[PDB]
Structure formats: C-alpha cells, structure tokens
Amino acid sequence: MSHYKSNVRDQVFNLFEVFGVDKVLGADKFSDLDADTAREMLTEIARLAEGPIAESFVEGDRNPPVFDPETHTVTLPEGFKKSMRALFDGGWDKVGLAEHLGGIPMPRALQWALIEHILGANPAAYMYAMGPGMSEIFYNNGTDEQKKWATIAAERGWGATMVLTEPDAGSDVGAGRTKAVQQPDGTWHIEGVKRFITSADSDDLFENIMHLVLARPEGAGPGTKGLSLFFVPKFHFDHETGEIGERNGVFVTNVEHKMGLKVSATCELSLGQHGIPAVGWLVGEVHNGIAQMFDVIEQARMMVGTKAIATLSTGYLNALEYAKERVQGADMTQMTDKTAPRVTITHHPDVRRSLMTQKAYAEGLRAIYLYTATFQDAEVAQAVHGVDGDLAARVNDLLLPIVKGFGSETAYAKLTESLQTLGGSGFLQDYPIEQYIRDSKIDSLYAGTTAIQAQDFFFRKIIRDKGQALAYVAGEIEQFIKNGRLKTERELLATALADVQGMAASLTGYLMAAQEDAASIYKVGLGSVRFLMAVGDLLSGWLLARQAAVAIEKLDAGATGADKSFYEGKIAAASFFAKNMLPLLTSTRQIIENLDNDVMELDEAAF
Amino acid sequence: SHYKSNVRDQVFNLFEVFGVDKVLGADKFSDLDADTAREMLTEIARLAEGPIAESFVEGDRNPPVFDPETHTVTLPEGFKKSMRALFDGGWDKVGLAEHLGGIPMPRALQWALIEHILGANPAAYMYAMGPGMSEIFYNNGTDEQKKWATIAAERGWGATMVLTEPDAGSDVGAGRTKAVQQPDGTWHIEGVKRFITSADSDDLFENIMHLVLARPEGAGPGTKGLSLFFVPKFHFDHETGEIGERNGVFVTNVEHKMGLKVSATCELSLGQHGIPAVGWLVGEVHNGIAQMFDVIEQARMMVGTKAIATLSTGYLNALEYAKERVQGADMTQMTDKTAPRVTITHHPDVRRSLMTQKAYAEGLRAIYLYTATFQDAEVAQAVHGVDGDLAARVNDLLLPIVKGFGSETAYAKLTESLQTLGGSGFLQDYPIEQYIRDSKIDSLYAGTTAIQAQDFFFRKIIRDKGQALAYVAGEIEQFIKNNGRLKTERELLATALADVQGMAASLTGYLMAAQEDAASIYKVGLGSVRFLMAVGDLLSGWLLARQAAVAIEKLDAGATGADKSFYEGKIAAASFFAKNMLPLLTSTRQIIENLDNDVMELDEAAF
Numbered sequence A: 001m002s003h004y005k006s007n008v009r010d011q012v013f014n015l016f017e018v019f020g021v022d023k024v025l026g027a028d029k030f031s032d033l034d035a036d037t038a039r040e041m042l043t044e045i046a047r048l049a050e051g052p053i054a055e056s057f058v059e060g061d062r063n064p065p066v067f068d069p070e071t072h073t074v075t076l077p078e079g080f081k082k083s084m085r086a087l088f089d090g091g092w093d094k095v096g097l098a099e100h101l102g103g104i105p106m107p108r109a110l111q112w113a114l115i116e117h118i119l120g121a122n123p124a125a126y127m128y129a130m131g132p133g134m135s136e137i138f139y140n141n142g143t144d145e146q147k148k149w150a151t152i153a154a155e156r157g158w159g160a161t162m163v164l165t166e167p168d169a170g171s172d173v174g175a176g177r178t179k180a181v182q183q184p185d186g187t188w189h190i191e192g193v194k195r196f197i198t199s200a201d202s203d204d205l206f207e208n209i210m211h212l213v214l215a216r217p218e219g220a221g222p223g224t225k226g227l228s229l230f231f232v233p234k235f236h237f238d239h240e241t242g243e244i245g246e247r248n249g250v251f252v253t254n255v256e257h258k259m260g261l262k263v264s265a266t267c268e269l270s271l272g273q274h275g276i277p278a279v280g281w282l283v284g285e286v287h288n289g290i291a292q293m294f295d296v297i298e299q300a301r302m303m304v305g306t307k308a309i310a311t312l313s314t315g316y317l318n319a320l321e322y323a324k325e326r327v328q329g330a331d332m333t334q335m336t337d338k339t340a341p342r343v344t345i346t347h348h349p350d351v352r353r354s355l356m357t358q359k360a361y362a363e364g365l366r367a368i369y370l371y372t373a374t375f376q377d378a379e380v381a382q383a384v385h386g387v388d389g390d391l392a393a394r395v396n397d398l399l400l401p402i403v404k405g406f407g408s409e410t411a412y413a414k415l416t417e418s419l420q421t422l423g424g425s426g427f428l429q430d431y432p433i434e435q436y437i438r439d440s441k442i443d444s445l446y447a448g449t450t451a452i453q454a455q456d457f458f459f460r461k462i463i464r465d466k467g468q469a470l471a472y473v474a475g476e477i478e479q480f481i482k483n484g485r486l487k488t489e490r491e492l493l494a495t496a497l498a499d500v501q502g503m504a505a506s507l508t509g510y511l512m513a514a515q516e517d518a519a520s521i522y523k524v525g526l527g528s529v530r531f532l533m534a535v536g537d538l539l540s541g542w543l544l545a546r547q548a549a550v551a552i553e554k555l556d557a558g559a560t561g562a563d564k565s566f567y568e569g570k571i572a573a574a575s576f577f578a579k580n581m582l583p584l585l586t587s588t589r590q591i592i593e594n595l596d597n598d599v600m601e602l603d604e605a606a607f
Numbered sequence B: 001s002h003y004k005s006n007v008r009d010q011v012f013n014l015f016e017v018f019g020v021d022k023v024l025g026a027d028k029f030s031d032l033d034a035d036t037a038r039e040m041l042t043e044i045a046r047l048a049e050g051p052i053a054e055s056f057v058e059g060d061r062n063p064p065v066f067d068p069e070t071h072t073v074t075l076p077e078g079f080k081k082s083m084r085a086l087f088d089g090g091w092d093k094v095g096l097a098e099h100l101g102g103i104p105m106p107r108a109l110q111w112a113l114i115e116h117i118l119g120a121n122p123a124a125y126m127y128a129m130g131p132g133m134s135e136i137f138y139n140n141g142t143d144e145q146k147k148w149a150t151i152a153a154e155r156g157w158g159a160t161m162v163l164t165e166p167d168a169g170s171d172v173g174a175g176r177t178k179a180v181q182q183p184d185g186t187w188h189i190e191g192v193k194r195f196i197t198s199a200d201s202d203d204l205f206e207n208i209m210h211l212v213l214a215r216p217e218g219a220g221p222g223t224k225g226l227s228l229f230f231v232p233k234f235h236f237d238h239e240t241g242e243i244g245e246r247n248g249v250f251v252t253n254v255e256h257k258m259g260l261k262v263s264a265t266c267e268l269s270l271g272q273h274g275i276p277a278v279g280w281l282v283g284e285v286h287n288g289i290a291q292m293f294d295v296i297e298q299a300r301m302m303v304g305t306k307a308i309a310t311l312s313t314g315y316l317n318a319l320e321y322a323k324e325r326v327q328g329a330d331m332t333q334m335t336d337k338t339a340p341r342v343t344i345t346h347h348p349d350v351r352r353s354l355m356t357q358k359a360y361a362e363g364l365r366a367i368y369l370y371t372a373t374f375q376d377a378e379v380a381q382a383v384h385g386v387d388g389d390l391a392a393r394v395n396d397l398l399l400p401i402v403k404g405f406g407s408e409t410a411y412a413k414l415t416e417s418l419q420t421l422g423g424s425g426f427l428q429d430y431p432i433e434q435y436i437r438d439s440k441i442d443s444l445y446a447g448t449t450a451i452q453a454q455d456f457f458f459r460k461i462i463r464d465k466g467q468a469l470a471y472v473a474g475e476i477e478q479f480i481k482n483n484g485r486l487k488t489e490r491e492l493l494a495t496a497l498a499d500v501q502g503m504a505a506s507l508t509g510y511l512m513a514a515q516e517d518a519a520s521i522y523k524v525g526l527g528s529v530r531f532l533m534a535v536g537d538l539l540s541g542w543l544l545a546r547q548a549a550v551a552i553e554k555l556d557a558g559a560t561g562a563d564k565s566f567y568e569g570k571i572a573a574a575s576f577f578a579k580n581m582l583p584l585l586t587s588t589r590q591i592i593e594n595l596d597n598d599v600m601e602l603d604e605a606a607f
C-alpha cells in the first residue's frame, strides 16, 4: 500500500471510549449522524487518504510546482491534481462546513479526526482544500451582501488564502505596510507585496481564489489595531450569478524553493503592482482586521498541530512495521554467542525504547488534539465536560498553542526516532520518513513560531485569562489523581502537576516583578517555551493514564484478540510515559526557578 | 559562502586550554611551530570558505548520475573543481606519515584542519580519505603491500571501507560475501555489498583501493571468521604503479538520499560480472575485524567531527541572521505599539536559542579536540601526563562520545539554528536546511547511536574495568575541588558528575543481576543511549567550565576588544550550560534507577 498508515482504531477509541463524543450523536444538531455513520465516515476518508491522496505524496515532492513568469501562474504535477479531484469528488472539502453552505454537520472532534487522514497522507492537499472553510469565516464576518458572495465561493469550491506576512512583517503582523485606498464607489485598492502566501495560485484546480488580505487603510493608526481585512478575489465576478469576469490585480511573482512541503505553492504575492488595481471589499464593512483574521489564524494553528501529529503517527507505524520484519543481531541475552539465532529488531531494548517513545507521544498527541476539539463546540463541551460556553472557549484557546507549539515541536523531534529505527535505510528517499521530517519542519514556523505560541499561551491564555482555563484543566488532572494498578502513574502525575504549578508561579512572579524592575520580564521569555512544552508533557501523561484506566476496565470486562492487544499497549504506553518522560519536569521546574538575566546582559559581540 | 569558520576558537582550545603548542617544534614535530600551525588553520579555513564551500549547494542540487552500463558515476563539475583545489593544496595529506608525503603534526591539529573541510563540503573530505586509508593499509600490510600503499598514497588513489550487506549492517559478522583462495595466494571475492561510500568517484582519481571484509571459504561464523582484503578497482603494476586491466568490482546502483547527496553511496558487486574480483589478504594474515576497526575508528572520529563542524557553521549563520533581522519591540515594551522595533538578538527566546547553539557547538569542539589530544602518545604525555596505554584507552572511551553524542546533539541543535531564521529557515536559499539533511545520517553510518552506546558501556567501560572512565572522572573532580567566581558552576558540575557515576553504577548493577536473571541485561540496553548522552553533557559542561576559567584569567590580565568579547562569551556559555543543561541529568539518573522490563515483556502486537 501507500506510504500513509492510518489509525482509525485509536481515533474511535478516543472519540467514544475516552471522551464520549458519541453521546451527542444522533440528536438535535447532529440528529442525522449516528455513531455508526461517524465511524464509517472515518474509515472511508482513511481509505481515500491511503489510496488516491497518498498516491501523489512522493510525486509532489519529486516533481514540484513550477512558477511561470509569462502568465504569473503556478503549474502543479498531474498526479497531485488527480489526488485533489478525488478529495473534491467525495465531498470531503465540505465536512464540518455549515449546512447552509452544503456541509454535513458534525462535532469538531469528528471533523478534525477526519482531516488527520488528509494531513497524514498528503498535507498540502488539505491546504489547497481549505477554501470553503474560509468562505464560511468570510460569511460569518460579512455583510448580508457579502454573505451571498461567500455562499457562491463555498458552493463553487473556490480556493482561498490568508494574506498577512510581508518581507519585514512576519511575527510582527502589526508592522505591515500594505496599504488600502478607499475608492469613490466604496471598494478599495490594495497596494503592497506579501510574502510566503500558501496557495496564492493553484494552477487550474479551481475557477477562482478568495484572498483574505490584511492591509492598512490610509490614515489608520499603527500596529495590528490599525489593520483591516479585505476580500480580494483573483477574478472579478458577478455578485449575484457568480459568473467569472475580468482578472483582478493580484499576481504571484515567485514560488519559494523549500526543504519540504514542496507541492504546496508558497508564493510572493503582489497587490496592485502590475498596472491594474487589486480591488478589495472591506469584510463586514467594518475596520476590525486582526480580530477577523484571527478566526482564520485559530483554524490554521489547529491544522498545523494536527498535521504534525498526523505525520508522526504515520511515521511511527512505518517504523514499527519495518522493525517487525528487519532481522539484525542476536537477542541481548545471547549477545556474546556468535552462533545464537538472529532476531527481528523489535527484540532489542533500544528499539523497543524508541518504538514506545514514538507510540506514547503519537497517541498522547492524538488525545490532546481530540480533547482540544471537544471544547470547540459549546454543546459537546456541555455534554461531555459539563462546562458552559464561556469556559469552553477559554479552554480551547488555552489548548490551541499546545496543539500547535507542543505538537509541531514534539512530532519533528520524535520522527528522528522513527527514522533511526530503519537504520541506514531511513536516510533513503525509498522510505517516507525522511520526507515526513522535511515536510514537518515547517510546522514550528508558520501560523506563528513556537516562541509566539509560548508567549500567547502564557501572556494571553493564562495571565490575561486570570488562570481560569488553566485552573479548570489542572482540576481535572487532580481529580484523576485522587481516584491500584495505576498508583505509580498517579503518583508521578502528581509530581508533574506540582512541577507545572511551580513553573507557572515562578514565571508569574517574573512578570509581576517587572512593574518595579522592567528587565524581570525577560525571564518570562527565557522560560516560556520550556513551560509550554512541560504543560504538553503533563497533558500527554494525564490523557494516556486516562486511556490506561479505560483499557483496564475493558480488559477486566473480557476484551480478547486485537482489542486486548490495543488495550495492553495503552497500559504500557501510559506507564512508560509516566516513568520516562514526566520526571524530567522536576529538573525543568528547578531550572526555571533559577533563571537569571546574565544571557540578556551579555554583549551581542560575545556570541 | 555558506561556510562560516571559527579558527579563533580552535586556536583558543589547541593552545590556551590544552597546550598543544608544548610539543610543537620538538621531537616528531620539529619543523612545525605554533606560528605555522596557526597559518595552516587560517589557510585551510580560507580555502574551505572559498573554493570548497563554493560547490556545497551545487552538489546537493546536481547530484551524481549513475551509468549502469559503465558502472560509473559522473560528478558535478563545480564539485570536482573543489576537489582539485583540495588536492592542489596538499589537504588530502594532512597528518599523513612523513614517509608517505605527509606533514607530521599532532592529531589535534589535523582534526582541527579537517573541521573546515567538513563544515564547508563534508563529502569532499570523504572523497579525499584515500591517502589516510592507504596509510592504514601500509601499517597493516606486508613489506610488499607497504610498497603498494606507498604508491596509492603518492598517486592520491581514492579508497573505500566495504563491510555492509543488505542483511549485515550493525551485525557485521553476519556478512556472507565470500573469499576463495587461488593457488598463487591471491583470493577471488564474491558477493554484493551495500551503502558503500565513494565506491565510484568519476575521474577524481586513477584508482580506488577497496578494503573489503569477506569470509574465507570454510572459515567460522561471526566477526572472528572475517578477513580483510585489498581489492583495487584497477589492477596495476606492483612496481611502477601503472594502471592495468579493470578488476571485477563494479558499482551496480547509487542510492537516492535525504542529504549528503554528492557522496555516491553504492551497491558494490564483487565477482558477479564474469570477471574475478581479485583481492590480496591484508598483511597476509586472517585478522579482518581487528584490521578494519583501525578504519572504523577514523570514520567514527570523522562523523563526529563532521556533525560538530556543521552545527558550528549552522550556529554562525543563525547568529549572523539574528544580528540583522528586525522584528518586534523589546519585551520591556511589548504593550507599546509605538515602541522602536529591535533586532531579534534582543528577544529572550532568541538569546536562549543562540546560547544553546553556542554552548553545544563550542562544547563539542572542545570534546573532539580533547579526544584528539589522547591520540598521540607524545601529546598525551606532554599535555596530560598519561602513558601510551592509558592514552589509548581514554581515546577509545571518548570516540563513541564524539560520534554518538556529537551526531545526535548537532542534529538536534541545528533545529534551533533553523528556528532562528523564522520561515526563511525553511528555504533552500539559506544553508541550514541542507545542514539538517546532510547531518541526519551522522547518527547512522559508522555504527548507529545505539551501537555507539553499547560499545561505550560494554567495551570502553566494563571490558576496560573502568580505568579510562575513572581517569576522566578524576580530572573532573580535580577541577571541581580547586577564585569562587565559578563556585555555582563547580557545584552544578559536582551534582552532574555524581549523577553520571550513579547511572554507571545502576547499569553495572543490572549487568551483574544478569548473572542470575538473564533478562536483567535488557535494562542496560534500555538505558545505554541516555547514559552516553549524559556523559556527553558532563564533558561539555566540564570543558566549557575549564574554558571559562581560562577566559577569566585572561580577562583579569587585561584582555580588550575582540579578545575580551570572546572571553566573556565563554564565561556566559559555561554558566548557561551548567544552569540549563546539566541539572536534567538528575532526573535522567532517577529514571535509569527505575528502569524495568515491562516494555520488554509487552506483546509485539500491542505496539
């Protein structure tokens, strides 16, 4: 089969046996989608991923897109376009889309589980397919007139882009200088050069592309607050009929050559620089740009995290399958005997250490993003968590930089163990892991760098939140800890929780002391990422231990066969994660408790 | 011009820290004084940064092309031109024995010289390793073979180490390639080898010496039954060197790799094309694995030095970028959207990252130069006061560190180099992504990290009765025991030293328990790589601390300007490493003290 190895079994286990998302299925908003249909949906997109979607994974990397300066367009390899047609023909770009736009209603937890398969098999395919979802965001933010245009864009499956970054403005979005000039007829002319725009052109995949463009109206103030969001289509079109008209002045001028994710066209995009204006329409006919744009950013951050987790999962399973077949060496209990029987490398302790490390972090990360997704629907959050809409939103916002930052960083690091498991053959393009590594390196960078995620997590999602979302999560961990076979795990989780509370308190002190000693805030920065990673480790450990508790109940009730093996691995992974990952948080707390500004006072020249 | 060298740090180590200048101008090194040594470094650094580095990108983007009908490789012109610059300067004869054309010099200086080639275009050094292998052949050869080795070295023949088969990588002793003795005393070699570096190399050289492991007919199993053979690509006149008829050793494939693409990695068929692969028994004795390990020890030294060289230019690139990239306001002014924009070196996380790159890069540089100072009996005596036997044992202990810890650390920290560039880090326009790809294999060839860790524990500690390890620990204890401007660092090093001693005792106890319950030996394997990495952290922190002590004395004495900045940076690095890296070893010790065989007893089906 393909490079892509899916894990529907683990998804369903999470959705049903752990979090109880089936308990909203079949009723009210989900009245026409039951537990059986949901599972059949996941099996169906998994087969599509493993089949036609994954089939062009290698081709997209080896035969990447080409920019044509003679038409300012991009050409995509034929095999990949065939994969995109499979994705559209099955309607998959419209699941979790609102019903009035043609979508099938469902819990966000099920939606992201479905998308995992596309991100595992060929992640750029999903990125090119994000158009209808951005049309929906345009709808929810648009005037009534604009809501008709967005409906046309979704129904016709136009592509879309998120257009923020400029050469001098990436992390600092508010430094952007792309300009908006209001016209007598109420439209705007956008003038600027944007950089690194994913899917800014898409060959002939779609009949139009909606660029959602941040730009500074003439006379507006500085920073992100001065920005507005504009609907800037690639082609003008009839506002009632949708018929495609003349070309608008928004042109790709280059495509970047990248380490990976090569089949995703990453483009420099010029607005109003080629002799015709880039006409835009103020979204909502209100000036509220960064706020509107962050509806898009939040989705993109969820997607990047889920992508990284999807890639590690298929990386692990590839590594595992390889280890099961590769004969090399004697059993360590016979290491001195040179006539001893050769064994498969799963018999070797370092390999099992490596595989269990890969397994626990992949499964722990899947649990994290599905858990994050159970707070993205007010009604799921009520039904499975007992929390109201306001708390749910804050808990989701707390968890997003974890999915994104902890997910991106952990997936790329643990794929190293996946490649290591293949020995020298892991360094070959013949196997998919080296491409997994190159494709996933970008996950720590776009949709906001790990450092930006760590800062949002602490400053905005904890401090500004007054700790409500964090206090909720920590309280759920504490309950699990208070409650036999899982006593050691609970004791280790107790230590990890205290360690994370200690780190939170040290950083809070550094921040609060900045009122009387400005440079104190630097210690917050020095510690932020390690703190984010620690909370990620804590969540992984908790959720795996929760999985183990369910697995114990299921084995006690008589699980057999393949089910019994699955449950047994949950117990093993949870125990291994508690005994091998969690204790390091203690040293990390002590390190964060002793941070100082020596590294900040050093002359730049001494580096 | 990707390659950024650091001759200043090399000289600082060679002379101010380790005192290699003490043997320069005396006995074996009479014609090389400290001035000439310094000029040799500056000279090859200039060559590396210019002509050698010039084809780094070309070799990746335009990799060798294989003709299966001729069984040859075509290399890209720009890269062959870099190879000619290397040869025209005599840099394929560094540290070669004087009677082969070499300039005598301590191994510490030679490896420092090679560092620049490995940083600039590592595959160029690999192609140029022929003369060094000729010298190894010389040392192991008969008087008549010594004459062939003299010819090969003088004519600049390339060379290969030929061990790996599809079914024998880590387990060298499972090799099935056969050697068939002929009545005249030559042998015919028959078999297929795999992953052979430089098995063909275009027209770079007039011949290749293949050093081939093969099993004489009827010999026993395992590594002890293997013999080592001289198998030239071309037959040649043993008196004049004149090249004769093609010998029966043909490249039949060339791998497609994630990185190091300009290095032809080849399937090599001996005696499969109707032409015998004639081989000559090295030293006309049956001692193959012992003989070949002279080669493996150089290769492991080279791979480590490669990883380290690449991280260093990785970091120096990241630092130069950070110094000129403006993004965001200072953290003391985050709230103010009017604040001045700053260069990213002002941000805590970036300074954390740069100092992590710096401390590991410079700590590793110190490790490999430290290791080299035990590689000459005369340098070890003059610099350390140790006899030749202890010197060899210490060098043997440190090589899996250089290789295993060097390779794993360099690859991991390059991730920070790439992150410093933000999204541009993901572009091929900058060299970091190729550093990552090129260096991923350093954890794999010349023995995987797990084989390094197994070698370290069982052979370089247990079979050594702890003597070399006890020597190094004693030196560390001496530094700790002896101003109190470094009291905190010495206290942290004291905890780390005891942590590592604790780990060694635990693993030793698991081994001893294996006399009673064989399965206990699995715990050694589970912990071996973490122990290797611990010792590497201990050495890094100790050597950085020694560097800081030197820098303090030199600052106290009145260093100004660029010297002052350099010395300040060493103090900041030693302090940062002790406070941010070393404490984690306490958690690692506690994890190793609680290893258990659960993960070993788990059904393979539960993964």
Ligand SMILES: Cc1cc2nc3c(=O)[nH]c(=O)nc-3n(C[C@H](O)[C@H](O)[C@H](O)COP(=O)(O)OP(=O)(O)OC[C@H]3O[C@@H](n4cnc5c(N)ncnc54)[C@H](O)[C@@H]3O)c2cc1C
Residues within 6 Å of the ligand: A161, A162, A163, A164, A165, A169, A170, A171, A172, A195, A196, A197, A198, A199, A261, A266, A442, A445, A446, A447, A448, A449, A450, A451, A452, B325, B327, B328, B329, B344, B347, B348, B349, B350, B419, B420, B421, B422, B423, B424, B426
């Ligand atoms: C493949 C790819 C696709 C992309 N697609 C899109 C797209 O469709 N739309 C779009 O708008 N953008 C897109 N981007 C842009 C991407 O989001 C930016 O590259 C990213 O936000 C980082 O910005 P930058 O490259 O300017 O790096 P910089 O902001 O210059 O950051 C460089 C370094 O400085 C650090 N840093 C910066 N500011 C701070 C701070 N305040 N505190 C601490 N550290 C800091 C960063 O962490 C990083 O280590 C894409 C990028 C890539 C690589």
Ligand SMILES: Cc1cc2nc3c(=O)[nH]c(=O)nc-3n(C[C@H](O)[C@H](O)[C@H](O)COP(=O)(O)OP(=O)(O)OC[C@H]3O[C@@H](n4cnc5c(N)ncnc54)[C@H](O)[C@@H]3O)c2cc1C
Residues within 6 Å of the ligand: A326, A327, A328, A329, A330, A345, A348, A349, A350, A351, A420, A421, A422, A423, A424, A425, A427, B160, B161, B162, B163, B164, B166, B168, B169, B170, B171, B194, B195, B196, B197, B198, B260, B265, B441, B444, B445, B446, B447, B448, B449, B450, B451
């Ligand atoms: C670019 C490149 C160039 C190379 N050039 C050469 C060359 O010129 N000459 C040459 O002779 N070889 C060469 N090699 C071969 C290289 O040395 C081998 O790939 C390496 O020794 C690992 O062997 P393997 O690929 O068969 O992996 P395997 O031996 O099959 O190992 C796969 C996995 O099992 C683990 N494992 C295996 N045995 C054990 C054990 N006993 N205990 C614990 N874990 C174990 C490994 O650590 C790894 O994680 C090259 C390899 C590459 C990638």
